[PDB]
Design a protein around this motif. Structure first.
Motif, PDB file in Angstrom:
ATOM      1  N   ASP A 180       0.930  -1.330   0.054  1.00  0.00           N
ATOM      2  CA  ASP A 180      -0.043   0.195  -0.075  1.00  0.00           C
ATOM      3  C   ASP A 180       1.219   1.373   0.234  1.00  0.00           C
ATOM      4  OD1 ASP A 180      -2.789  -1.866  -0.122  1.00  0.00           O
ATOM      5  OD2 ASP A 180      -3.084  -0.452   2.322  1.00  0.00           O
ATOM      6  N   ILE A 181       0.396   1.732  -1.394  1.00  0.00           N
ATOM      7  CA  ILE A 181       1.336   3.019  -1.000  1.00  0.00           C
ATOM      8  C   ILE A 181       0.626   4.595  -0.406  1.00  0.00           C
ATOM      9  CG2 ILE A 181       2.364   4.980  -2.609  1.00  0.00           C
ATOM     10  CD1 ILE A 181       2.983   3.252  -4.945  1.00  0.00           C
ATOM     11  N   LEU A 182       0.551   4.467   1.100  1.00  0.00           N
ATOM     12  CA  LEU A 182       0.215   5.660   1.871  1.00  0.00           C
ATOM     13  C   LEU A 182       0.454   7.313   1.504  1.00  0.00           C
ATOM     14  CD1 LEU A 182      -0.134   2.774   4.617  1.00  0.00           C
ATOM     15  CD2 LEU A 182      -2.850   3.658   2.910  1.00  0.00           C
ATOM     16  N   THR A 183      -0.715   7.650   2.442  1.00  0.00           N
ATOM     17  CA  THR A 183       0.406   9.781   2.591  1.00  0.00           C
ATOM     18  C   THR A 183       0.565   9.636   3.188  1.00  0.00           C
ATOM     19  OG1 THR A 183      -2.079   9.752   3.206  1.00  0.00           O
ATOM     20  CG2 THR A 183      -1.710  11.060   1.309  1.00  0.00           C
ATOM     21  N   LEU A 184       2.264   9.857   3.030  1.00  0.00           N
ATOM     22  CA  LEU A 184       3.200  10.424   4.666  1.00  0.00           C
ATOM     23  C   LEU A 184       3.017  11.957   4.522  1.00  0.00           C
ATOM     24  CD1 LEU A 184       5.369  10.041   6.040  1.00  0.00           C
ATOM     25  CD2 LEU A 184       6.713  11.090   3.950  1.00  0.00           C
ATOM     26  N   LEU A 185       2.355  11.758   6.416  1.00  0.00           N
ATOM     27  CA  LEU A 185       2.074  12.889   6.777  1.00  0.00           C
ATOM     28  C   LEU A 185       2.954  12.962   7.514  1.00  0.00           C
ATOM     29  CD1 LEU A 185      -0.730  12.451   5.703  1.00  0.00           C
ATOM     30  CD2 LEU A 185      -1.604  12.334   7.735  1.00  0.00           C
TER      31      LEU A 185
END
Length: 59
Positions: A26-31
């Motif tokens: 999964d490519i997720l939003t790096l906050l």
């Protein structure tokens, strides 16, 4: 930094409330990318943390 992207290289298991479960690939939003150990992501509404080694970012 704020809304970048990171690839969850492995299957992470939720251990504490601060963290969240991710399915490898999964490519997720790096906050929040501050903290070498334990980054803050947003896997489906509701952010949380997951270790660094698990997440592949783009520098």
């Amino acid at each position: 930094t704020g809304k970048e992207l990171v690839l969850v290289l492995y299957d992470y298991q939720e251990k504490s409330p601060r963290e969240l479960t991710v399915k490898k690939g999964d490519i997720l939003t790096l906050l929040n990318s501050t903290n070498k150990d334990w980054w803050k992501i947003e896997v489906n509404d509701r952010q949380g943390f997951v270790p660094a080694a698990y997440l592949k970012k783009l520098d």
